[model samples]
Target: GSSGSSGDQEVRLENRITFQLELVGLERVVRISAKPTKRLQEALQPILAKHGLSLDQVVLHRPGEKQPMDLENPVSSVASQTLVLDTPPDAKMSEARSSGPSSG
Candidate 1:
């Protein structure tokens, strides 16, 4: 057993907010923090780097919503909810094209 300091010393309003990042393919939960005023793309930069992902390569969506979040929208405008990180259809198409060439 060990003893540690126990006191609510630091008390201040936080300008940043934390949200859950449900990585679609990775199937992992990543907690991300960002300023409420920051845009989604801006907030996602750090995590994107961690997972070797790029803004153009992925899409952001709500739990049950079919549409992705708008990159231009501020973080606070998202109903302060969890975000699903998945690859965009365009990215998939481009990756598929990297294989053998085909007429379409």
Candidate 2:
């Protein structure tokens, strides 16, 4: 519940940003706010873990054939603004591609 006085009212819009983490062939839905890059990585930790994957960094590509977003070295929200789920980057994309059905 929100705190307010009898004569005062409040309206709140959902503050959230969403993007996709495209692994090669796999995609996971990601949601976040306009926070720092460090926090962004933290937020993505659990979600990535759910898929038995981990990221030492992240590279973002915008809506065009633009250069990749370099997170000042170790990928962070600081260097990256909003987010989008598109394709895979060169550095790391092995897991994104499916290895096909398991032998077992």
Candidate 3:
């Protein structure tokens, strides 16, 4: 999808579970297909940038979890999961992230 500061930015797509992604204070109830987290991150970059956002500024809430997602974990492990994208508190956000989830 093309990145633009338009209206109703819901990201419904094929082969993906429907959910809402909140970025830069905007909400998007969408479906995104399975792929490596990095790949997904890359695809999201442009769309997010439309609102002056970035992957580092993002957070994930995948299904069946009390805590936010740990990006260091493999994406292949939860490709079909329902997810929620957001930004968390600094300390909590750090624990959910790593030196680089893609750093390995």
Candidate 4:
């Protein structure tokens, strides 16, 4: 479905990389992508239902009555930033290089 232009192709690559990170495990590559786990998605389901839009299949859901690690404060006071999952021991490479200064 690509138009074959360089820019579009790059965007497609980004999508594919993101999709693979979400649905499949590509560790180092996906770690750089820094996907949220299934737990995060499941966790947000009820919250999203209140908004009437569920997360996409590629997205993750957290389980239990989970709260964002830093949910003690309201979001408006907190800057808009992507949340980072604490890396497990096995996810070494993923932790090695993710979320640089600008992105972090």
- Give each model's whole-structure lDDT: 0.69, 0.43, 0.50, 0.31
In the order shown, the candidates' Cα RMSDs to the true structure are 9.2, 11.5, 13.2, 15.2
Better of 1 and 3 by TM-score: 1
TM-score of predicted structure 4:
0.20
In the range 4-71, model 2's lDDT, one tens digit per residue, is: 64453234333443444444334554544342334544555655565444445444554454776543
Which pairs, if any, clash in model 1?
A: none
lDDT value for candidate 3? 0.50
Instruction: Encode model 4's per-residue lDDT on 1-104: one tens digit a residue.
Output: 65653322221121211221221232332222212332334434543454343444223322232643433232222122233332332333222344423343
**Which residue runs does candidate 4 get wrong by more than 4 Å?**
1-38, 57-81, 84-104
Superposition-based RMSD of candidate 2 using all C-alpha atoms, in angstroms: 11.5
RMSD of 4: 15.2
| TM-score for predicted model 1 compared with the true structure | 0.63
Off by over 4 Å in 2: 1-14, 27-38, 57-60, 63-97, 100-104
Worst 10-residue lDDT window for candidate 4 reads 11-20
lDDT of 1 by residue, 1-104 (tens): 99786543323445887778785755568788888788888888776675566888888888899688797887766535568888643334232233234476
What's model 1's lDDT at 57?
A: 82
C-alpha lDDT of residue 78 in model 2: 29
Error of 2 at 74 (Å): 14
Q: What TM-score, over all chains together, does every model reach?
A: 0.63, 0.35, 0.39, 0.20
